[PDB]
């Protein structure tokens, strides 16, 4: 139903990225314009001029970490529509019904679909917006624009994207921009660059290209102790059955993720209001107090599964140093030799406490998480539009960043999505509040036009 | 939206009973007439003349067995709309959203709502049809009618109902009837009539009236080993903390209900087709082979809970004969003395194998299940409209009973709901297929009118 | 401590088979002779002359079905000593302590060790009796003996065993014999002999020899729906990742094993008394009523795991006929073509109801359970010592078979172990009562000598 | 077997307290002297002169917190003997066997006995040492003694105890002392003294005496968010069915206890060596990093149970302020009015963040945990025997406190048990290492005598 806008026309909304965050906005807009769900939508005149720019060739949801068997870490009810409107055609349950699979999923008695299934649910959602999404487009910069060039008022933005295949630059003009680009791979600064040192985000993509023979006796190390590291470490024994694997962590042990009901309530959509209204001190204190819900934590079932495997090695061999798969707690990497004639790097280890063994490995999987600062690069040319002296983007409750009112028209603005954890809570980078947030976003961006019909 | 029909007018549909079975038909009709869900509904002219007759004063779902804590025995996905259309406003999830309770239910991580909650979900559904439901109306008979009295063709039915409060008889004429009246309480024929002998269906209703003091030291017996007996036996220790309870069963032990996924697939809506198409031999054989999914079975968690309580008695006292709460396996009642001057009846027991103890009790809770033959009484006057010599109602796949084509107009008919287990499967008397069956029913009854618009 | 008896000497006890049943007798005897556990053992004079004959080269516990990951189906508390005496050095917990593994097993929070671990526990037990066990000895016949050849009284037995490696026959004389030889592989009589048709008992042993390349695209069928079939079917997708597998069952679905607490109590050691004392009618009726505890049943977790895998195939492909791993319910094999030039047999299928597809397979795994009648062949020459006209062995409560008192001395006898399900219950062929039964056996066999010391 | 020593004689060991810690020492000594378990014990000459002093009238294990239904928070394998020797007659499993209850406990499939059952297991253990335990004896002071009064060398200690019933002081002389007195109730310093303000440790003891009518409509508050608070809060709705309850916590939510396998390994007996050998910095850092295993945490099942109850209140009433049972997160008590004429105290609340409601309550249950500094009072007169200038007791690895070698004979010493968390780990105050620690203690105290026999 959402028809495309020609590249040359001034858009109402331009969204950078087409992952879950932007997809949920697209769904919310569809629903707000659906007369079947929003009775006032029968009176809307023109369709808003909207466009989504995605750098991937097609919709994919963390494809490099689509480890076989890997499950969702959130209830399917927290899909892209249900918490806002269970009547929506974009719910996970309606998707299953459409695929002829609803009765079968029911028989599984689980709230946790496979990652592979949930990606397909979101792929199914994404495809219905193909006319308004430009794939293979990496946005490189956002530039302020003045429709009256002689004035001192900014009232639009130019979004410039590089074609991933051809390398050419395109420009699209919009009144309002949304940055929903997720996070970048975080690597420890001490580790050197080498094709054998690969971030977890590229596990399914890059590793099989490097270690082509699945039956060879490789030595493979994993750095980290989060969900990503545990998943890779568990997968390696299956993917490379004859390989010797090592898990290197600086903590003493893998620790369970906390989804206990009372604690879990921080992820409730209505709690964003309460969290935002807290002071910087209480917000920082609150984030630290509830960290075990999301960061440096592993799902209990996975910890137990790994532990069980470790015990089975003990049954077969009482000598820990002879085990095929090992875990080295409270260790840090101090040096990596990678200029030797052999295919194996040499990793020097020490205690993580305030010296130890050396490992020879064919590959080092680095599962050290993500940073969320990629938007900063894209927004460098619009920095001067912030209030004088303010050197950081300040998102409001509605995610619209603060800009000097005397420099920027009220019709122009920039919204940030999925990088606002410090201001909005631990549900910000997740799927938790996407259905509800998407609806709030549509009301914040298209509210004026939707009021005319209401 | 469904407007009432005056009592004097010829109805298109008259439904006897307004429990889940009829409620799901009402919901399906609403949805078939909703242009938002069925695009062809924009062209329908007149609303069908429909009426539901319910004997209870208001909607209640097995209120006599609303034991505190009692849970659902089926996934909430198998509600009254979802398996047919997850977009419907009558889904369990939309209900929760409407009550402002969806995020909270999500945090429970359960597919099994409390019975109390699910009744309220269905109460919420039922209330939106209050204009087309006549409460306090017990249907007593269905009578064949001929619009041309001199002809030999029946083309309508008179439905006669007794007002529960006033005792007066009313009559409503309809082309099509649905009998969806559930089941009647089954009592062992050997047990005599006494106010102290109460069926499980009346546990919350009748027992507190008989045993008014909750702190008194009563002796209370429970007969049976199904879900009802286990629930009552478990509840009694809480409801009457100082009472001595006994569970009398003829089996050796309580046995778990089977909801293992492969086995559970017999409850799939599309399987009704496959089950109906089987022969009488294969259907009888199939029902017997899968009995542990529904009959004489208890949910595992409840069995374990009871067992745990029994063990705690063993910790406190190694003498089984001194226990406050006891279970007597493989026993049958042979005689009940109930003419003695005391308040306690005397129950004589024997082995159930092809003699034993005597119990003195203030009340005997009889949890011996249900029969489904109440429709037979209401349909006695229409029996002669069946094909010559046929002494049982033969429901088709679409639940319409066979009638002689030369005696009954094609516009007239009678449908049976919830009593067709032998022909339609073990999902027939349950909630399992209600959403889908309701939709099939609407197509079978109102199909002609809905085709004109489609 | 148990010293060996020379082959030529008259033994007090000769045991045929050294599996769990006989191992538990050996342990019980050790414990009865241990002054630390039985205070009267300080006064015993001579060690009884005992010998165990085992056909396997060394102790192994169903080695052909040691599928990777396969777990125990019984609590570790029901090991070979604990239920009789938790102080015994032969308990599972003491074994773990001896291996330096007790604290680690504790951290697993499971009552269900790996099959591989529990076999090693029993191997550990078995090794301490190596001096009184003759491995590589297959017993072929038991012969009545008369120390006075001119009399008509039997007072000993000759046990004849064939050396598995050399083929020679040895003879050992004993007053008392125990037959504890477990069960033989049951094959459907309709299936023809072929190296590609293999019983489940030989899965780990025989299949890898036939299908040597684990990466080849084989077609592999599994017949059955018990624990063995489910385990093999689940394992095949891992063992042969590129092979197309089929599960052929005559039932409609895999059904869960019943270990619900009240029901499980039939396995209690003290219940053997109660079960034995029942009539043939009640025993047959009782066995049939509780069949789901042991036969044609699969552990719930495994059913769910398989079901989950099947659903994952549905996610990837909605076409069931294209799935790599398939299950064909309610089917029976009617013909097997196996004289064709290709490596694949052709299996003709029909409905199991009172016609279907053809499968081409490289191997057929037959998981159709076991028979327990091997003792009959070994006892043919002693049949005439039973009471006149009695054509079946009648074991007493103490497992000693009935023999004519005028033909057999009171000092001579034959005991049956693990084949007495019809007389002793569903715990007879299991590990359930082994600790307690072993102790009863020692008292039944060595009671006279142990009374002198007591 | 352990015979009593007359009060006047010099003891080898005097133990202050007869709870789990001391009980495990008694058991270890029994086992070390049992020739059946320790082969060298056949050669020991004299029984050591040992005595245990307990202030309670008889053995009781946290009797004031024996809330109905309350379960163990540790595997039964970590009983008072098993991890040291599974052959011991003092194991939990042997206890069950002795009570005729082993097969039944097995059928529960749980590692977590009821608190009531486990106390009875330890009561059963304790009774076999009744001849060497003096009940009703509260130790008040430990005094250094010099057998040569003119010398400057201490070589014994006088232990002085007050009879709880009569008030008289008794004195017992010993070479070696063990202080195993557990912890004292910790109350917030801001709360005033009042009979209506009761510590959790006295919940079952003191509250029913204050609130005698269980059916009255009381207002009852609970302060805290640990296991104790959750247990009391959950129990109150059952114990006082018509009472309005409030949970006051300064944290945002109840948080789950961590027993994930890898993390749980800190509780392994052999890990005490590794923990003790760490520096003060690493030990403090380690304790803080693993706090969620023991402190301010609730068992997941209990959190969920409470949460479920809270949701059921939401079903019945959407207004949180009308709920019978409520939880007030992030609150602190600032003032308590308790001089008013009514029976209800007035509690003034504020936010716990760096103002709120007032509660009127009949009782305030204070579940604010325990302190472990009671030994300091008893050891004041022996303080000067520590090395010059050292103002804190420094326990060695073997739990023997450091004393000046020139002041104290090598035959004299004082050991601390259950208060050494800072030096020995999080397993110190628990049941976790009691079996193993008890054995280490016996070797540390009676080692010289046991070497003569070995
Ligand atoms: C392996 C993994 C599994 C997870 N699973 C869960 C889960 O089970 N439940 C849960 O609640 N949370 C989960 N998360 C958290 C995760 O952040 C969210 O599920 C989700 O990815 C957030 O969506 P987003 O759109 O904000 O970011 P993303 O999903 O990363 O979407 C960003 C998109 O923008 C595109 N993009 C980036 N830069 C540019 C550019 N310059 N120009 C154009 N396009 C660009 C990217 O290609 C990407 O498609 C998971 C995270 C990971 C890494
Ligand atoms: C205690 C209990 C709990 C259950 N819980 C579950 C569950 O968890 N999940 C599940 O799938 N199945 C469950 N069932 C099965 C149950 O049959 C269905 O949930 C459901 O009740 C079937 O609906 P129905 O309309 O066919 O029958 P009913 O629900 O019995 O509805 C029949 C209605 O017709 C009315 N009526 C009867 N006779 C007349 C008359 N002569 N005139 C007018 N009105 C009349 C009655 O008042 C009643 O309201 C349960 C059954 C019981 C007894
Ligand atoms: C794969 C599998 C797994 C099982 N797991 C469980 C479980 O988890 N828990 C449970 O309670 N039950 C289980 N069982 C049931 C099983 O019957 C018992 O665990 C156990 O094997 C019974 O011991 P047994 O000594 O009676 O028979 P077996 O264990 O079969 O021992 C018989 C021994 O006698 C030897 N023998 C046979 N014939 C001769 C001869 N002519 N001469 C000399 N020696 C001979 C055999 O080599 C064998 O070693 C399992 C069964 C199978 C097939
Ligand atoms: C309610 C509760 C439940 C618990 N449950 C668990 C559990 O499930 N698992 C677990 O591992 N840990 C648990 N714990 C931890 C607990 O500390 C240990 O289980 C155990 O109590 C430690 O034993 P102890 O002998 O060191 O201390 P205690 O058990 O407190 O024993 C001290 C004894 O010394 C006596 N005493 C004190 N002062 C004197 C004196 N001056 N003179 C004479 N006698 C004195 C006391 O009467 C008492 O009997 C629990 C703690 C509490 C409060
Ligand atoms: N199929 C099975 N699960 N067999 C094992 C049965 C063991 C039995 N439930 C017991 O506790 O002793």
A252-264 as b/e: b if 16+ CB within 10 A: bbbbbbbbbbbbb
Q: Is C426 in the pocket of ligand 5 (CB under 6 A)?
A: no
Atom in ligand 4 nearest the alpha carbon of residue D54? 44
Q: Is D416 labelled a binding residue?
A: no
Taking a C-beta distance cutoff of 8 angstroms, is the pair B62, B414 a contact?
no
Q: Is B101 part of the contact surface with chain D (CB cutoff 8 Å)?
A: yes
List Cα–Cα distances, D233 to C150, D227, D362, D367, in angstroms. Answer: 85, 10, 15, 10
Question: D233 a known binding residue?
Answer: no
Enumerate the residues of chain D whose CB falls inside 8 A of the CB of residue C86: 86, 91, 93-94, 97, 102
- Calpha distance B315→D71 (Å, rounded): 14
- CA–CA gap between residue B438 and residue D238 (Å, rounded): 42
Q: Whose CA is nearest to atom 49 of ligand 2?
A: B19
- Containing D422, the helix (H) or strand (E) segment is helix D421-424
Beta strands B11-16 and A325-328, pairing class: unpaired
C-beta separation of C156 from C412 below 8 A: yes
Fold of A1-454: FAD/NAD(P)-binding domain (3.50.50)
Determine the distance separating the centroid of ligand 4 and the alpha carbon of D62, expressed in angstroms. Answer: 7
Cα–Cα dist A386/B95, whole Å: 45
3-state secondary structure of B219: strand
Interatomic CA distance for residues A181 and A375, integer angstroms: 7
Q: Which of B125, B38, B33, B24 is nearest to B80 (CA)?
A: B24
Q: Give the torsion through C-alpha atoms of D89, D95, D101, D104, to 10 deg.
A: -90
**Ligand 4 test: best mutation among D178, D181, D301, D415, most atoms within 8 Å of CB?**
D181
C-alpha gyration radius of chain A: 24
Name the residue in chain A with its Cα closest to that of D264. Answer: A253
| Bridge pairing between strands D184-185 and D370-371 | antiparallel
Alpha helices in C155-226 (DSSP H): 203-210
What is the resolution in angstroms? 2.3
Does D265 contact C at CB distance below 8 Å? yes
User: Which chain A residues touch C100 with a CB distance below 8 Å?
Assistant: 318
The C-alpha angle A39, A43, A47, rounded to 5 degrees, equals 105
From D75, D82, D106, residue closest to C75, measured CB to CB: D106
DSSP class of B395: B
User: Which residues does chain D have within 8 Å of residue A281's beta carbon, measured at their own beta carbons?
Assistant: 354
| Cα D91 from Cα D86, distance rounded (Å) | 7
- Inter-axis angle of helices B115-127 and B20-32, nearest 10: 50
Ligand 1 atom nearest A61 alpha carbon? 29
Q: In the block, which residue shows the tokens 């945490």?
A: D297
Domain boundaries, chain B: 1-454
Say if residue D442 is exposed, middle or buried (CB neighbours under 10 Å; 0-12, 13-18, 19+): buried
Cα(A440)–Cα(A29) distance, integer angstroms: 10
Among residues A391, A401, A417, the alpha carbon closest in space to that of A272 is found at A417
Distances (CA, A) of B44 to B26, B40, B193: 17, 8, 54
C438-447 burial, b for 16+ CB within 10 Å, e for fewer?
bbbbbebbbe
CA A454, CA B382: separation in Å to the nearest integer?
Answer: 55
Inter-axis angle of helices B227-239 and B300-316, nearest 10: 40
Measure the CA dihedral D336/D340/D344/D345, to 10°. Answer: 0
H-type alpha helices, C242-400: 261-264, 271-276, 280-289, 300-316, 375-378
- What are the φ and ψ backbone dihedral angles of D416, each rounded to 5 degrees? -110, 135
C365 CA distance to ligand 3 middle (Å):
20
Cβ distance of C314 and A104 shorter than 8 Å = yes
Contact C365, C345 (CB under 8 A): no
List the chains bordering chain B where 3 or more Cβ pairs fall under 8 Å. Answer: A, C, D
Helix (H, G, I), strand (E, B), or coil: what is residue A335? strand
Atom of ligand 4 nearest to the CA of D138: 42
| Two tokens, residue D39 | 């082969």
Residue B301 vs residues B119, D269, D437: alpha-carbon distances, Å = 22, 35, 38
Residues whose CB falls within 8 Å of the CB of residue C274, separated by 6 or more in sequence, listed in order: none
Q: Residues for chain D: how many in total?
A: 454
Q: Which residues are registered as beta bridge partners of A15?
A: A52, A178
Q: Does the CB of C256 have a partner CB in chain B at under 8 Å?
A: yes
Residue of chain B with shortest Cα separation from D308 = B108
- DSSP 8-state secondary structure symbol assigned to residue D395: B
* Pairing label, strands B345-351, B358-361: antiparallel
Asked if A114's CB is within 8 angstroms of C315's CB, the reply is: yes
Residue nearest to atom 2 of ligand 5 (CA): C294
Measure Cα distances from B379 to B396, C205, D203 in Å.
17, 66, 64
Residues B79 and B71: their CA atoms lie apart, in Å, by 14
State the Cα–Cα distance between residues D302 and A170, nearest whole angstrom: 58
D touches which chains (3+ CB pairs under 8 A)?
A: A, B, C
DSSP-derived secondary structure for A355-391: ---EEEESEEEE---EE--THHHHTGGGGGGSSTT--
The rounded radius of gyration (Å) of the Cα atoms in chain B is 24
Torsion, CA C309, CA C315, CA C320, CA C323, rounded to 10: -60
In degrees, rounded to 5, the angle at the alpha carbon of residue A449 between the alpha carbons of residues A446 and A454 is 110
Taking each helix axis from N to C terminus, what angle separates A115-127 and A20-32, rounded to the nearest 10 degrees?
Answer: 50
Helix or strand (DSSP H, E) at B209? helix B203-210
Whether the CB of C264 sits within 6 Å of ligand 5:
yes
Alpha carbon distance B317, B325 (integer Å): 12
Tokens of A111: 């709230």
Nearest protein CA to atom 52 of ligand 4, as residue: D62
**First-to-last C-alpha distance (Å) of chain A:** 20
- Residues of chain A contacting residue D353, judged by C-beta atoms under 8 Å apart: 282
Q: Which chains, if any, share at least 3 CB pairs under 8 A with chain C?
A: A, B, D
**DSSP string over B355-371:** ---EEEESEEEE---EE
Q: Which ligand is nearest to the CA of B434?
A: 2
| Residue that has been written with the tokens 């020679």 in this structure | C168
Ligand nearest the Cα atom of residue B17: 2
Check if A449 contacts B (Cβ < 8 Å).
no
- The percent of chain D in helix, strand and coil, each rounded to the nearest 5, is 35, 20, 45
CA of B61 to the centre of ligand 2 (A): 7
C191 exposed, middle or buried (CB, 10 Å; 0-12, 13-18, 19+)? middle
Across the interface, do D102 and C83 touch by the CB < 8 Å criterion?
Answer: yes
How far apart (Å, rounded) are the C-alpha atoms in residues A279 and A275?
9
Residues facing C246 on adjacent strands: C221, C326
Q: β-strand C50-53 against C133-134: which pairing, if any?
A: parallel
Closest ligand 2 atom to Cα of B418: 26
Would the CB atoms of B102 and A88 count as touching at under 8 Å?
no
- Number of helical (H) and strand (E) elements in chain A, helices listed first: 14, 17
β-bridge partners, A139? A161
Picking from A107, A307, A315, the nearest residue to C116 by CB comes out as A315
Please state, in angstroms and rounded to a whole number, the distance separating the CA atoms of residues A122 and A24: 10
Q: Which residues pair with B327 in a beta bridge?
A: B247
d(CA B80, CA B438): 8
Q: Is the CB of C257 under 6 A from ligand 5?
A: yes
Cβ-Cβ contacts under 8 Å between B and D: the total is 40
User: CB–CB of A199/A35 below 8 Å?
Assistant: no
B317 reaches C (C-beta below 8 A): no
* Residue C438 CB less than 6 A away from ligand 3: no
Tokens 């209640």 belong to residue: B60
Residue C105: helix, strand or coil by DSSP? helix
C-alpha span between D128 and B327 (Å, rounded): 35
Alpha carbon distance A7, A5 (integer Å)? 6
Torsion of CA A91, A97, A98, A101, to 10 degrees: 120
- A163: Cα separation from own chain's centroid: 22
| The three-state (H, E, C) secondary structure of B28-44, written as one string | HHHHHCCCCCCHHHHHC
Cβ–Cβ gap B258/C260 under 8 Å: no
Per-residue tokens: A260: 């206990």
Q: Give Cβ neighbours of residue C136 (< 8 Å, ≥ 6 apart).
A: C54, C55, C56, C57, C163, C164, C165
Which chain C residues contact residue D111 at CB under 8 A?
A: 109
Tell me if A75 is assigned to a ligand binding site.
no
Q: How far is D447 from chain C (nearest CA, A)?
A: 23
CB atoms inside a 10 Å sphere around CB C141: 17
Residue of A nearest to B101 (CA): A83
Contact B87 A85 (CB under 8 A): no
D384 annotated ligand binder: no
Q: What is the bridge-based pairing of β-strands B169-179 and B11-16?
A: parallel
Q: Which residues of B touch C292 (CB under 8 A)?
A: 292
SS3 for D52?
strand
The response to whether residue B178 sits with its C-beta less than 6 Å from ligand 2 reads no
Beta bridge partners of C359: C347
Q: List the end-to-end C-alpha distance of chain C, in Å, as a whole number.
A: 20
Number of H helices and number of E strands within chain C?
14, 17
Rounded-to-integer distance, Cα C415 and Cα C177, Å: 6
Q: Which DSSP string do the residues of C409-439 spell out, in sequence order?
A: -TT-EEEE-S--HHHH-TTTTSSTTHHHHHH
Q: What CA–CA distance (Å, rounded) separates A79 from B142? A: 49
Residue A314 contacts C where some CB pair is shorter than 8 Å: yes
Query: Are D157 and D144 within 8 A, CB to CB?
Result: yes
CA distance A427 to chain C (A): 28
Cα–Cα dist D249/D230, whole Å = 11
Packing angle, helices B300-316 and D115-127, rounded to 10 = 30
Cβ atoms of residues A368 and A143 within 8 Å: no
Q: How far apart are the first and last CA of chain D?
A: 20
User: In which residue are the tokens 């993720």 written?
Assistant: A257
Long-range contacts of B385-393 (CB under 8 A, 24+ apart): B385/B144, B385/B154
**Are B83 and A102 a contacting pair at CB < 8 A?**
yes
Is A317 annotated in a binding site? The answer is no
């Amino acid at each position: 139903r959402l028809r495309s806008t020609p590249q040359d026309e001034l858009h109402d909304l331009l969204c950078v990225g087409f992952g879950p965050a932007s997809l949920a906005i697209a769904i919310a807009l569809h629903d707000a314009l659906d007369p079947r769900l929003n009775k006032s939508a029968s009176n809307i005149h023109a369709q808003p001029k909207i466009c989504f720019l995605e750098r991937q060739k097609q919709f994919a949801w963390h494809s490099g970490m689509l480890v076989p068997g890997s499950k969702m870490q959130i209830s399917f009810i927290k899909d892209l529509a249900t918490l806002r409107d269970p009547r929506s055609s974009f719910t996970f349950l309606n998707y299953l019904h459409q695929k002829g699979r609803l009765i079968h999923f029911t028989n599984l008695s689980t709230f946790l679909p496979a990652r592979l299934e949930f990606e397909d649910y979101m792929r199914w959602c994404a495809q219905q917006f193909s006319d308004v999404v430009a794939y293979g487009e990496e946005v490189v910069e956002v530039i302020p624009g003045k429709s009256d060039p002689s004035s001192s008022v900014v009232d639009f933005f130019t979004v410039r994207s590089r074609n991933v295949e051809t390398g050419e630059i395109s420009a699209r003009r919009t009144r309002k921009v949304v940055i929903a680009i997720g996070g970048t791979a975080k690597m420890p600064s001490g580790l050197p660059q080498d094709p054998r040192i690969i971030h977890s985000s590229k596990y399914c993509t890059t590793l099989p290209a490097l270690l082509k023979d699945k039956s060879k006796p490789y030595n493979i190390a994993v750095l980290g102790s989060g969900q990503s590291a545990a998943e890779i470490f568990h997968d390696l024994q299956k993917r490379y059955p004859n390989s010797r694997t090592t898990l290197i962590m600086r903590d003493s042990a893998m620790r369970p993720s906390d989804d206990s009901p009372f604690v879990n309530e921080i992820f409730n959509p209505e709690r964003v209001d309460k969290f935002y209204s807290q002071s910087a001190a209480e917000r920082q204190r609150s984030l630290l107090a509830d960290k075990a819900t999301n960061y440096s934590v592993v799902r209990l079932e996975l910890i137990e599964e790994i532990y069980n495997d470790m015990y089975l090695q003990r049954v077969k061999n009482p000598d820990e140093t002879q085990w095929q798969h090992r875990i080295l707690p409270e260790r840090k990497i101090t040096r990596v030799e990678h200029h030797g004639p052999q295919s194996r790097m040499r990793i020097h280890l020490k205690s993580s406490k305030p010296v130890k063994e050396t490992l020879e490995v064919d590959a080092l999987m680095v599962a050290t998480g993500y940073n969320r600062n990629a938007h900063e690069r894209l927004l460098s040319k619009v920095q001067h539009l912030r209030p004088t002296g303010q050197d950081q983007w300040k998102p409001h409750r509605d995610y619209r960043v603060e800009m000097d009112p005397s420099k920027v028209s009220s019709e122009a603005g920039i919204w940030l999505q999925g990088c606002n954890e410090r201001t909005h809570g631990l549900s910000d980078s997740l799927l938790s509040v996407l259905a509800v947030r998407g609806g709030e976003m549509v009301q914040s961006i298209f509210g004026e036009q939707l009021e005319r019909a209401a």
